[PDB]
Amino acid sequence: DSIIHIGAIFDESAKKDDEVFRTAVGDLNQNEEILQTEKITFSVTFVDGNNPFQAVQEACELMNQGILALVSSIGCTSAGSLQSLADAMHIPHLFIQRSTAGTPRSGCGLTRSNRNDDYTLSVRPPVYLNEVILRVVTEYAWQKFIIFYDSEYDIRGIQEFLDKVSQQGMDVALQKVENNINKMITTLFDTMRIEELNRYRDTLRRAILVMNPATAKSFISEVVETNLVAFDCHWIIINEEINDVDVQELVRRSIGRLTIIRQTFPVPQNISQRCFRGNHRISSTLCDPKDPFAQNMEISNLYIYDTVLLLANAFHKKLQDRKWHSMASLSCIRKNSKPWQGGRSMLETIKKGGVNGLTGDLEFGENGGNPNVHFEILGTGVRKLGCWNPVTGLNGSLGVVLRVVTVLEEPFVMVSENVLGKPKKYQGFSIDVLDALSNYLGFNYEIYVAPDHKYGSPQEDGTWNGLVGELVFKRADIGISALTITPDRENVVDFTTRYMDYSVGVLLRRSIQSLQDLSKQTDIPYGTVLDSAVYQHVRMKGLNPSMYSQMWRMINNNVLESQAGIQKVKYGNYAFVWDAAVLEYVAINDPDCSFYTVGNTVADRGYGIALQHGSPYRDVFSQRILELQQSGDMDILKHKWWPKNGQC
Amino acid sequence: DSIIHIGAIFDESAKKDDEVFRTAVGDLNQNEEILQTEKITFSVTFVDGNNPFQAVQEACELMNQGILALVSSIGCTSAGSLQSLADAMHIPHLFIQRSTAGTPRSGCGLTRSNRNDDYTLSVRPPVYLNEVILRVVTEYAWQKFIIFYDSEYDIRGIQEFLDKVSQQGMDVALQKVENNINKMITTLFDTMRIEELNRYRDTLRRAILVMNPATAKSFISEVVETNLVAFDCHWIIINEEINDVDVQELVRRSIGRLTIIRQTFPVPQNISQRCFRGNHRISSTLCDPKDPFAQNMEISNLYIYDTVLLLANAFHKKLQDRKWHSMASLSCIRKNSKPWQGGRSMLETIKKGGVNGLTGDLEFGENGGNPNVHFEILGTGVRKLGCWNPVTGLNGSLGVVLRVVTVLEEPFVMVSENVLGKPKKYQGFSIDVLDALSNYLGFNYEIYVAPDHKYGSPQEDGTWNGLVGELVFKRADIGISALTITPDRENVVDFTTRYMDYSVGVLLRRSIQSLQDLSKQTDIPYGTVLDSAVYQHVRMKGLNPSMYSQMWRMINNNVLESQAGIQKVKYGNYAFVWDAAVLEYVAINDPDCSFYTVGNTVADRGYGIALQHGSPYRDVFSQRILELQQSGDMDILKHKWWPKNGQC
């Protein structure tokens, strides 16, 4: 004989809320401490969340069955109808808001009729998206950015945030991400001229993604493939429901800096205390983070569980104090439709209840809404940067001299000053990268050139020469130059991150437009320094498995050493293969502007900073090189010596 | 015996929809051509638009009464419940959307369950606000603007427009106008620094008001009083329901350029054809634009009228073809709830109906929505600039030599060049205003100075001297100088618009901060040119009814003529009263930067352009002077000679 019967109305896509609803029911019927001798029965109905009248009709049939409370897991479309019906029939309505397809939640904005008592309790906490996103952009001190939302977001969710940022003078644009992304980026190309397009690419340097993880994944991958974003972009993704499978896929798909903000549930750490809240035992499928279901649980599943646990404890108190109110068979829209007599007392019991659950500590304020909410902050691998909750706000914030061996190369390392009676000064891109590390890390340095001016080749003795050899023999601490990171060099010295990509380019005389064009004509013969790295590099590619075979066939007579190639293209018919960045500087700073550079191969290797093997600074230097890249300052220093302004 | 019974559900603030509903009922019962022998009865219910369950419950009681169709005049809050209920009971639902407090309409975004037939007909046309506002900003070629909406607008109404403008690279900010405006502008002052504030004032030069006329009136008056906007601002107000009383109050309260876009109803012009649509006679209170009620009719009142007229014609056809379907007593949420058998045929009849009404031609498309909508475009007095409708789109778009007499005055009219063997050239602010008129109007001119260098004083003979006298004797056509518009001069010559305000200022030597400070101390004695205009002007104010009395008491010994005042302040203790704009130029272009100017009285009179009495160009010249003011180009020319950059 059942005296406890609860109601459930579910949107059709809430199958997981039903499964956890039933399992929470079974778990409480096994708990002998709560409702020791009385069983809980239920009536579950699935309805179309887009039909508020269907939701009412099926809710009345549950009330006609006779229930103590109505739990609904449905969207804001039918929440207005279920909130006002509950007030009319005096049935406690534990409302769990579901967003469509995992999109970010927006407050229902219900402006519900306050003439009558509010019989609806919002189990889920308030949507603080505008508050959290405001703290993040204030910490990062953003001033111009664009906010993306998918086709399912309710932008009134940011109607306060758009006012706060407009009070603070920020250039904030919005933009819906269509359900057809490939067409959308393709569409942008037609509307905007080439001159206009750069502003969009520049704006996307700081963007905020308010969208479900699915569109977050596709939209990040789509822009990266179309190279609208670069290694300096900083995107913020915020959504309440973003599981770890999405986090790894977002980080794997994205370049640059990415900040993720999602809701977290403060739950015990111990393995024993993970499936126990006091003496209550939880089914392993929901509390064990090593079970596949628990990892695939929706956030709504957690609040469905803690709802039933709170209902049982609200029922347990009412029986103990002997103030119980039996269910009634209520009728809607009848001549004698009468409210549930015991609704008002049942409501006051539930509203003052509190439980420990999967969501954490569930409780209700005086307004009838759950006040507990916690967001974690992730950042790029990926790691936790801090916490946020609406009570504590934001938590977790978001010179020794070293021997430097160089090799002269314009514009990386050059002699800027050499006046009789003064110490030798240097300048260049490699020097500027060294100064930024010296300026931030707070180390000083003394720079000397390799005795033979060589980058370094392995000798038969087993001792390296050139710049690398100096670091082998501990004659220097750091090696700064146009040094490409090679496997051989990594064996003897330890490298940091690449601070720029090294490509093989060709110098032409004022018709060729690429190495491909270069590798198929014979009007202009071409070569590169004999037996040098670039000589071998074009050879090794040609020999083993479609231009490197036709490039090696030609160079293999037409070869030369050192600068002679630059002059050969100047006063002769010849295309010079060499480092593209060195050639690029040559063609830019040509006193007669007689050259242009093509090529720019896919960069197998890139420039690096070598330290003597086992250096304790490699890790920290790699950090600051990464930061200058992911902040764009490299693009400031690259423009100093490689300006595309138009001198030539 | 009644066989025609219709239903009505109204939001409580739809009293005017009920009154016109009943009067439309009486008007059709008098029409002997339509429903010749059968009367129409009705059941009207007023409900809270914020309670969708109350709307259903009271709708079921109307269906239980037995009705052929349900007309509802309510907001989108309860429209979802009434659209799906109608589909379930097969009751044709003529839905009229009401916005809250006259705020701009937004589409209900209902994503209504399409599994079943849609028994709801939207009597009101679709919301084309994003389309109309996009055409207006494209015509005006705006590139940076801010969009204001009141607390009642549903910004998803502009979710497409924000994407189109972001595709087009425009700097578009949004900003809700709080219901407390005085606090809001006061609040802005605290948040933003003085340097930041100018950007907001500069952005408001082009703003769009998407709000009800009430907040439009207060918000325009509030910014003008706080001088956040100036004579060059261009604001666009768009709303579907903006009656003429609002239009005149908006124009009276606003400065600058104002464009108003509102819905218009193409109705016959003739007095006879205003209250007749074929043989149908309309009550005078609704069709007569000279009746006070008809002028105070809501837009929803017009669609309530044409709804009943369409229902009667839909009923008239069904009786004539002998296909009628009698009403049924239907029950909601019952064991045997059954749909109205005759609903499907009644729906198809209504959907293919068409009537001439107050709204114009009412008809329905295949989607079940009214396709007819027309917007008019007003602009500043106020006049109609064009029309817009979604089918035709936008309609209505949005050198003889003259003798010029001048008077030398820096920096208005100055000799720029006077080299032996060349004609005399001139420069200055007054000249630049003349060149802009000569450049646009396409007239040429020859400039000569008044023989005596005088602006002009009335002689005893009755013949003016100076610059005015030349225009009296038709010796010149236009008078360009630092000429203030005086009543005496208006008597003999005709003036155009003021192209700048003339104020009385004081020159000080590097402590006084205003004429008020100036008019209360005696440490520094002060005067202005004897018996000149400024001498009299300070006198006349002092004599009749609090500083002009203390100013006249002092100057009344300390007076001087021409430049002597400037030198007196330079090499002596003395404050010089004179034209503030002439003094301002003097203090700016001081070779030793020894002066500053205070004062800037309220300008009773301002500079003007005089023409010989009865000139046919005064009107057109006044136009181009107005345009340069209301476009800001005067602020470009004023800065040429009065730059606040900081030379001194």
Resolution (A): 4.2
Q: Which residues of A touch B61 (CB under 8 A)?
A: 333
Phi-psi region of B123 (alpha: psi -120 to 50; beta: other; left: phi over 0): alpha
Distance CA A471, CA B628 (A): 72
CB B87 within 8 A of CB B118: yes
- Secondary structure of residue A79 in the 3-state scheme: helix
Distance CA B609, CA B562 (A): 24
Q: Which fold has domain A401-493+617-624?
A: D-Maltodextrin-Binding Protein; domain 2 (3.40.190)
Distance CA B107, CA B97 (A): 9
User: Which residues 6+ apart lie within 8 Å of B277 measured at CB?
Assistant: B309, B355, B356, B357
The first and second tokens of residue A581, run together, are 């960045």
| Count of all residues that appear for chain B in the document | 648
CATH annotation of B129-239: 3.40.50.2300
A176 to B167: CB separation less than 8 angstroms, yes or no: no
Which residue, chain included where needed, has tokens 């900081």? Answer: B646
CB B7 within 8 A of CB B67: yes
| Count of all residues that appear for chain A in the document | 648
Nearest to B51 among A51, A77, A113 (CB): A113
CB A76 within 8 A of CB A87: no
CA distances (Å), B433 to each of A36, A287, A529, B636, in order? Answer: 94, 80, 69, 11
Q: Would you give the DSSP letter of residue B500? A: E
Distance CA A603, CA A162 (A): 43
Nearest CA in chain A to B82: A53
Give me the residue spans of the domains in chain A: 4-124+270-368, 129-239, 401-493+617-624, 503-602
User: Which residues 6+ apart lie within 8 Å of B620 measured at CB?
Assistant: B441
Interface A-B: count of C-beta contacts within 8 A: 111
The closest of A44, A41, A40, A42 to A10, measured between CA atoms, is A44
A56 to B188: CB separation less than 8 angstroms, yes or no: no
The string over B244-273, giving b where at least 16 C-beta atoms fall within 10 Å of a residue's C-beta and e elsewhere, is eebbebbbebbbbbbbbbbbbbebeeeeee
- Angle A200-A204-A207 from CA coordinates, rounded to 5°: 140
Half-sphere exposure of A277 (CA within 13 A, CB side): 23
Q: What is the dihedral of CA B54, B60, B63, B69, to 10 degrees?
A: 50
Q: Which residues of A touch B50 (CB under 8 A)?
A: 111-113
The CATH number of domain B401-500+608-641, selected from 3.40.50.720, 3.40.50.360, 1.10.3210.10, 3.40.190.10: 3.40.190.10
Q: Which residues of B touch A56 (CB under 8 A)?
A: 53, 56, 81, 333
Of the residues A333, A334, A337, the best mutation for testing chain B's interface (the one with the most B CB atoms within 10 Å of its CB) is A333
Residue B381 CB burial class (10 angstroms; 0-12, 13-18, ≥19): exposed
On the question of a common fold for B401-500+608-641 and B503-602, the answer reads: yes
Q: Which fold has domain B4-124+279-355?
A: Rossmann fold (3.40.50)
CA distances (Å), B532 to each of B524, B535, B578, in order? Answer: 22, 5, 10
* Displacement of CA A19 from its chain's centroid (Å): 32
Distance CA B2, CA A336 (A): 29
H-type alpha helices, A408-525: 429-441, 466-472, 487-492, 515-518
The first and second tokens of residue A42, run together, are 């239920």
Which residue, chain included where needed, has tokens 């109609």? Answer: B384
CB neighbours (10 Å) of residue B491?
Answer: 12
Nearest CA in chain A to B337: A57
CB neighbours (10 Å) of residue B513?
Answer: 11
CB A532 within 8 A of CB A502: no
A135 and chain B in contact, CB less than 8 A: no
Q: Closest Cα of chain B to A198: distance in Å?
A: 11
Q: Closest Cα of chain A to B588: distance in Å?
A: 33
The closest of A573, A570, A569, A575 to A551, measured between CA atoms, is A575
B113 to A50: CB separation less than 8 angstroms, yes or no: yes
Q: Closest Cα of chain A to B103: distance in Å?
A: 16
A230 and chain B in contact, CB less than 8 A: no
CB neighbours (10 Å) of residue A416?
Answer: 10
A88 and chain B in contact, CB less than 8 A: yes
Report whether CATH 3.30.750.200 matches the domain A503-602.
no
The string over A448-469, giving b where at least 16 C-beta atoms fall within 10 Å of a residue's C-beta and e elsewhere, is ebbeeeebbeeeeeeebbbbbb
CB B350 within 8 A of CB B306: no
Residue A592 CB burial class (10 angstroms; 0-12, 13-18, ≥19): exposed
CA distances (Å), B7 to each of A457, B2, B18, B364, in order? Answer: 96, 14, 11, 20
- Secondary structure of residue B7 in the 3-state scheme: strand
A60 and chain B in contact, CB less than 8 A: yes
Distance CA B62, CA B123 (A): 20
Q: What is the dihedral of CA B174, B178, B183, B187, to 10 degrees?
A: -30
A146 and chain B in contact, CB less than 8 A: yes
B169 to A199: CB separation less than 8 angstroms, yes or no: yes
The string over B178-211, giving b where at least 16 C-beta atoms fall within 10 Å of a residue's C-beta and e elsewhere, is beeeeebbeebeeebeeeeeeebeebbbbbbbbb
* Displacement of CA B604 from its chain's centroid (Å): 27
User: Which residues 6+ apart lie within 8 Å of A522 measured at CB?
Assistant: A554
Experimental technique: X-ray
A50 and chain B in contact, CB less than 8 A: yes
Nearest to A51 among B60, B113, B146 (CB): B113
CA distances (Å), A486 to each of A449, A456, A468, A603, in order? Answer: 20, 11, 11, 12
A167 to B191: CB separation less than 8 angstroms, yes or no: yes
**What is the C-alpha R_g of chain B?**
34
Nearest to B52 among A81, A154, A200 (CB): A81
CB B407 within 8 A of CB B388: no
- Angle A351-A352-A353 from CA coordinates, rounded to 5°: 95
Nearest to A50 among B61, B111, B174 (CB): B111
Q: Which residues of B touch A77 (CB under 8 A)?
A: 80, 111
Of the residues A84, A172, A184, A202, the best mutation for testing chain B's interface (the one with the most B CB atoms within 10 Å of its CB) is A84
- Secondary structure of residue B86 in the 3-state scheme: helix
Superfamily of domain A4-124+270-368: Response regulator (3.40.50.2300)
